[PDB]
Design a protein around this ligand. Sequence first.
Ligand SMILES: CC(=O)N[C@@H]1[C@@H](O)[C@H](O[C@@H]2O[C@H](CO)[C@@H](O[C@@H]3O[C@H](CO)[C@@H](O)[C@H](O)[C@H]3NC(C)=O)[C@H](O)[C@H]2NC(C)=O)[C@@H](CO)O[C@H]1O
Length: 30
Amino acid sequence: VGECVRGRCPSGMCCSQFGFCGKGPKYCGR
Ligand SMILES: CC(=O)N[C@@H]1[C@@H](O)[C@H](O[C@@H]2O[C@H](CO)[C@@H](O[C@@H]3O[C@H](CO)[C@@H](O)[C@H](O)[C@H]3NC(C)=O)[C@H](O)[C@H]2NC(C)=O)[C@@H](CO)O[C@H]1O
């Protein structure tokens, strides 16, 4: 859960190096 479409997620998240998403360090650089 929280997995990107291999680079993106819904309107506001950023995506990680496993392709999970959020607005924390490894998701958005912060
Ligand atoms: C400096 C660096 O990049 N170090 C590498 C480690 O980060 C990496 O571990 C894996 O990191 C990723 C994030 O980049 C982890 O992602 C998490 O994956 C879980 C899976 O259920 C997910 O729920 C989380 O949301 C997601 N978080 C983020 C922030 O994306 C992942 O868990 C780490 N390892 C494993 C085995 O799952 C390791 C190994 O890949 O390498 C370092 O070089």
